[PDB]
């Protein structure tokens, strides 16, 4: 109410003592626990822990990898988590040499069952999946635990190191020779419909385009063949109604200039991957296109 009260500068939390300090200050009691500086006091990023079976911890142990929930019609687990790299054994987009390569590493009592759940029913994969974010600082317990980043930059605590997102080279593609100073990242499922079976076609597609109208229009050039497959499945099969050629959804954004090729290393089995650097997380709802 006072005119000086509005003349005061906006509060700085760092100048103020932490609330654990203010309580101890009145009684002047001294606890053994440190109080001068609460950690994680300054993080715009938000996180939530994801318990995972230990047969999928590999490659995820390296910081920076996409995670997606995979809903199951079984009551337990209702939602097995899936690696972006473990997802590629099913995708047709992966090279046949790379597909036989990594698959030997991911074999497990648990991970092999996840492939069976993609064959349980007709329903398309994009309905069965939901993007979660990316891991930082794996716990690596006997029951694996992960700290997924719902939003914001991936980084080590106290900002000591900024983790970079890792994306396989087989899925990555560029829409333009001229990258802008900024470009959003888009996970994009695609379905090349076919007689005996409709294969998934995963792609990672960074682009300077942001508006949904301009993005889908250029998307139809590279994917016109799968678009032709969709109507072709209709005319061949009366009383059969396949839907959705694919799905686009926002995943985040990157500084573009920081992008450069890299490779994962595990079990003496290197795997080249595109390496986005300061990938702030910005999850987006699925947006089907035909």
């Amino acid at each position: 109410m006072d005119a000086r009260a509005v003349a005061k500068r906006p509060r700085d939390p760092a100048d103020e003592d932490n609330e654990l300090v203010t309580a101890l200050k009145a009684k002047r009691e001294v606890n053994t626990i440190s109080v001068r500086y609460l950690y994680h006091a300054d993080h715009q990023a938000l996180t939530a822990r994801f318990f995972v079976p230990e047969g999928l911890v590999e490659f995820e142990a390296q910081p920076g990898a996409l995670l997606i929930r995979m809903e199951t019609g079984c009551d337990s687990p209702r939602h097995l988590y899936i690696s972006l790299y473990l997802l590629g054994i099913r995708a047709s987009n992966v090279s046949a040499s790379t597909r036989c390569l990594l698959e030997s590493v991911y074999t497990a009592s648990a991970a092999r069952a996840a492939l069976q759940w993609l064959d349980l029913g007709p329903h398309l994969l994009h309905r069965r999946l939901e993007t979660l974010g990316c891991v930082k600082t794996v716990s690596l317990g006997i029951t694996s635990l992960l700290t997924c980043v719902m939003r914001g930059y991936l980084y080590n605590t106290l900002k000591t190191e900024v983790f970079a997102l890792m994306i396989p080279k087989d899925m990555y593609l560029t829409w333009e020779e001229t990258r802008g100073r900024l470009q959003y990242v888009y996970l994009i499922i695609v379905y090349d419909y076919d007689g005996p079976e409709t294969r998934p076609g995963i792609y990672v597609l960074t682009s300077s385009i942001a508006h949904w109208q301009t993005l889908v229009d250029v998307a139809r050039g590279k994917f016109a063949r799968e678009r032709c497959s969709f109507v072709n499945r209709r005319i061949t099969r009366p009383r059969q109604i396949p839907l959705c050629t694919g799905v686009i959804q926002k995943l985040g954004w990157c500084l573009a200039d920081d992008i450069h090729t890299s490779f994962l290393v595990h079990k003496e089995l290197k795997l080249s991957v595109v390496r986005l650097d300061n990938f702030s997380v910005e999850l987006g709802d699925f947006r089907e296109f035909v």
Partner: protein, 49 residues
């Protein structure tokens, strides 16, 4: 509670509150007095021995 290591379930604080009640059991003692003993304790007759 007690501290525990990483990869294990923890122990969130568990405040607990309870309230005792009370029982009751009254007693009573009848006792008789002869009506003559009352009337002699009350009224006093002539001072005969």
């Amino acid at each position: 509670r007690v501290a525990s290591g990483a990869g294990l379930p923890t122990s969130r604080q568990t405040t607990i509150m309870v309230t005792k009640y009370s029982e009751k059991s009254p007693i009573t003692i009848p006792f008789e007095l002869s009506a003559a003993c009352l009337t002699y304790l009350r009224e006093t007759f002539e001072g005969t021995i």
